Design a binder for this molecule. Structure first.
Ligand SMILES: C=C1[C@@]2(C)C[C@H]3[C@]4(C)C=CC(=O)OC(C)(C)[C@H]4CC[C@]3(C)[C@]1(C(=O)OC)C(=O)[C@@](C)(O)C2=O
Ligand SMILES: C=C1[C@@]2(C)C[C@H]3[C@]4(C)C=CC(=O)OC(C)(C)[C@H]4CC[C@]3(C)[C@]1(C(=O)OC)C(=O)[C@@](C)(O)C2=O
Ligand SMILES: O=C(O)CCC(=O)C(=O)O
Ligand SMILES: O=C(O)CCC(=O)C(=O)O
Ligand SMILES: [Fe+3]
Ligand SMILES: [Fe+3]
Lengths: 288, 295
């Protein structure tokens, strides 16, 4: 009795941040995405939002009407440089790694994943809805492999300020990771274009774990006041190249304080790729 | 020529002064092609001499195996060889061809370095399993021959490549087979029935080879010949390199590279387009070359 008996049915499962990893993962497989409510302790999600606000204030807003994803949407990636909670607390969630290890790692080969980006995405008010897309369009041949292709990218998309249907929370399309052809989503290339059934709604600290095969896009921010802010944990196979060059921007001072696993996530350490003439790059960097 | 003898596959050969279009047409037809004189014999000889110390301090690994042993493999060529970083990586024919393979309209450089490896096959070294280089990116075979290119290799003879000292065994036209499998008895139906052909080359020659081409280092049946190679391994901008070059190459060497050589090693970004644009391997909307001070 979830929709009125007889209704058309719109599946967007939700789990507590305290459930098992296999539980959350099974929802990921079946739907392509899933919500983790309280993925981040609320003091953290709050101390974090404060910590990056000054960097966010020095980001001018584009009012372009050119269809961009930069039109009235603020984007900021130096989260580890500018936020102690982020680099010390958020990136060390064992749920994150336990799930990454289930999407990506092969047995006896160590961590099969690393970071692509740490973006804070703040959808400004009056911002047009973002073009629909699969995140794996970042790796342009991936769509060519269809839903039998391996996973390349997952996104722990975390709500900073509340995600309403009015302030433009992300429009998901669960199950589009099993459609038989992966196209771009436009009138010329997508046959279902205009008939794609979206499904929007989260509180500060929640997140959703979306596959890279899943169609989505930020909605229109219809409000006058609400700067709707997010923090996306983009994580990729170790064979793929990060969009952010973190091991050259993030200073060595911060890297020495990270875990072995987090140095691996930012490329300050190698995995069984990105080495140094037959040896781990961590030797040459001063990290034993 | 040979006497109704069985005729092997054609490995096409071009001098480094042929047009990049003529060389690329062969690469596209066969998946591989020799470029005679890719490096000058003077340039290669000084490279071989500039790396030789680090090469002698490399111990030969001998094992009780089918292990890919008794092969020295050295990757710090930029740090050890002025000739390599000043001249070899500035081959305009190398970049012409990379562009024709990897670069998209309006995006700039579609490619960068995966590795710069001196590969010295020792006397008696066993032959290498037949493989495609794109098995490094394990999902690539599943796209088959219609797949895009992920990797090409400019595989240079530093010392002569003979059939007896272990010149690479190549399979022209294996990039057009309808199914790409690992070359094992379990998965490959042509296992044991695959005809290869050596890359007979003189020093400074190279062959350009697709990641789709089946190949393997040959057996070095000589007693004296240490068969040296320089592998310039080039991948598309979205793939991760084997070597963390931007972290082990010193900035002093970085600041002295052309801007395309900085891009090759990750000291500089390239622009990818999706209506959207982004600097791949970049710094919060800016080319990484800013934060590093490279203008
Ligand atoms: C250029 C863009 C790309 C190509 C990549 C994309 C990226 C890395 C994609 C997937 C991902 O896993 O993680 C995040 C959430 C960090 C996003 C961040 C935003 C950008 C950098 C991007 C952009 O800023 O465009 C002006 C876009 O908004 C978008 C969706 O159009 C893209 O596909
Ligand atoms: C581990 C190996 C990998 C996975 C990669 C491969 C690599 C990067 C492949 C492609 C390439 O373009 O560059 C070069 C030519 C430099 C080679 C160098 C040698 C190694 C590092 C490798 C190895 O050392 O095996 C003992 C191999 O020989 C082989 C065939 O098993 C592989 O496919
Ligand atoms: O901000 C959002 O709601 C989604 C943005 C997104 O998916 C992207 O930038 O790739
Ligand atoms: O040494 C050779 O000739 C072949 C090397 C090779 O194919 C590899 O290491 O991948
Ligand atoms: Fe997205
Ligand atoms: Fe090879």
């Amino acid at each position: 009795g979830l929709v009125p008996r007889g209704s058309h049915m719109p599946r967007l499962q939700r789990f507590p941040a305290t459930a098992s990893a296999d539980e959350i993962f099974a929802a990921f497989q079946e739907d392509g995405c899933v919500v983790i409510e309280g993925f981040i302790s609320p003091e953290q999600v709050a101390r974090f939002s404060q910590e990056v606000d000054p960097a966010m204030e020095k980001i001018p807003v584009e009012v372009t009407n050119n269809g961009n994803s930069n039109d009235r949407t603020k984007r900021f990636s130096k989260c580890v440089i500018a936020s102690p909670t982020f680099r010390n607390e958020i990136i060390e969630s064992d749920l994150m790694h336990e799930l990454c290890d289930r999407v990506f790692s092969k047995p006896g080969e160590g961590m099969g994943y690393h970071f692509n980006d740490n973006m804070v995405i703040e959808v400004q008010p009056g911002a047009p809805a973002q073009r629909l897309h699969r995140d794996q369009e970042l790796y342009p041949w991936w769509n060519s492999m269809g839903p039998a292709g391996p996973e390349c990218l997952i996104n722990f998309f975390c709500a900073v300020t509340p995600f309403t249907e009015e302030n433009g929370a992300t429009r998901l399309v669960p199950g589009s990771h099993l459609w038989p052809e992966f196209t771009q989503i436009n009138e010329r290339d997508c046959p279902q274009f205009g008939k794609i059934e979206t499904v929007p709604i989260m509180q500060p600290g929640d997140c959703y774990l979306m596959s890279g095969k899943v169609i989505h896009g930020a909605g229109h921010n219809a409000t006058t006041t609400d700067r709707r802010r997010a923090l996306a944990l983009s994580i990729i196979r170790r064979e793929l190249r990060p969009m952010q060059a973190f091991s050259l921007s993030v200073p060595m001072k911060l890297a020495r304080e990270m875990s072995e696993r987090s140095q691996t996530m930012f490329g300050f350490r190698s995995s069984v790729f990105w080495g140094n003439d037959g040896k781990d790059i961590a030797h040459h960097l001063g990290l034993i």
